[PDB]
Paper text:
UdgX excises uracil from uracil-containing DNA to concurrently form a covalent bond with the resulting AP-DNA. Structurally, UdgX is highly similar to family-4 UDGs (F4-UDGs). However, UdgX is unique in possessing a flexible R-loop (105KRRIH109). Our earlier studies allowed us to propose a reaction mechanism of UdgX, which involves the formation of a covalent bond between H109 of UdgX with the C1′ position of the target deoxyribose sugar concurrently with the uracil excision from this site in DNA.
Substitutions of His109 in MsmUdgX with Ser, Gly, Ala, Gln, Cys and Lys showed the loss of its covalent complex formation with DNA but gained canonical UDG activities. However, H109 substitutions by Gln or Lys, showed poor activity. Further, the overlay of all the structures of UdgX H109 mutants showed that the overall structures are very well conserved with a Cα RMSD of ca 0.2 Å. As anticipated, we note a clear difference in the sizes of the active site cavities in the various mutants. When we arranged the mutants in the order of increasing cavity sizes (left), we noted that the canonical UDG activity of the mutants increased with their increasing cavity sizes to begin with and then with a further increase in the cavity size, the UDG activity declined (right). It suggested that the initial increase in UDG activity (H109K to H109Q to H109G) occurred because of the efficiency with which the water molecule could be localized to make a nucleophilic attack on the C1′ position.
Residue numbers in the entry: 1 to 207
Write the structure that this text describes.
């Protein structure tokens, strides 16, 4: 077995899966991170949302999407008329990957390698098989690539309803921008990008 696969227990119970992920050594990222950050939500959710990895705040909160990026996504979900009872939100990698600077106000997130994404993917498959979502929203390049291939380009397929035969349960897949990209740039570009994120979320909610 490769990566996290022998660390994943034979259960679909999300509490048991989350506990087991706390003991995962499927790649090196568990060493420096505070804790594993599993997904949040319930198995009745119809929409699954996948980001890249927990960030500085999530690493310590023990919860996904608790910082500025989470607040922007919340603003977008509200504008797309998506109830939070319908969501299961998680990340492609479950340990924060980072370095620090000397005068930074945060620990600096680093990009997971394809090896780490592939190593952690067993947790994502377990989450997908446990929740059985009707649609999976892929927030950013790392998450999209995790399920759609290392060559996939979000910018080229944003907001298209995709279906790949290798994904368990054949949910609809919708790739979109990662909310953290929307925190930067000119006001009108952020406003334009925010409306496009809402669009992609509305496509997913209409699956
Ligand atoms: S990032 Fe994923 S595969 Fe790597 S140790 Fe953490 S939970 Fe396991």
């Amino acid at each position: 077995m490769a990566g996290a696969q022998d660390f994943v227990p034979h259960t679909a119970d999300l509490a048991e899966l989350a506990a087991a992920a706390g003991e995962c050594r499927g790649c090196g990222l568990y060493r420096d991170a505070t804790q594993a950050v599993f997904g949040a939500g319930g198995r009745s959710a119809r929409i699954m949302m996948i980001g890249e990895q927990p960030g500085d705040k999530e690493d310590l909160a023990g919860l996904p999407f608790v910082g500025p990026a989470g607040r922007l996504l919340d603003r977008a979900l509200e504008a797309a008329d998506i109830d939070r009872d319908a969501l299961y939100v998680t990340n492609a990698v479950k340990h924060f990957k980072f370095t620090r600077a000397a005068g930074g106000k945060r620990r600096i997130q680093k990009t997971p390698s394809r090896t780490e994404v592939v190593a952690c993917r067993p947790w994502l498959i377990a989450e997908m098989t446990s929740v059985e979502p009707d649609v999976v929203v892929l927030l950013g390049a790392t998450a999209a690539k995790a399920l759609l291939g290392n060559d996939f380009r979000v910018t080229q397929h944003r907001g298209e309803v995709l279906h790949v035969d290798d994904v368990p349960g054949d949910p609809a897949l919708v790739a979109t921008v990662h909310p953290s990209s929307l925190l930067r740039g000119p006001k009108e570009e952020r406003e334009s990008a925010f409306a496009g994120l809402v669009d992609d979320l509305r496509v997913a909610a209409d699956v």
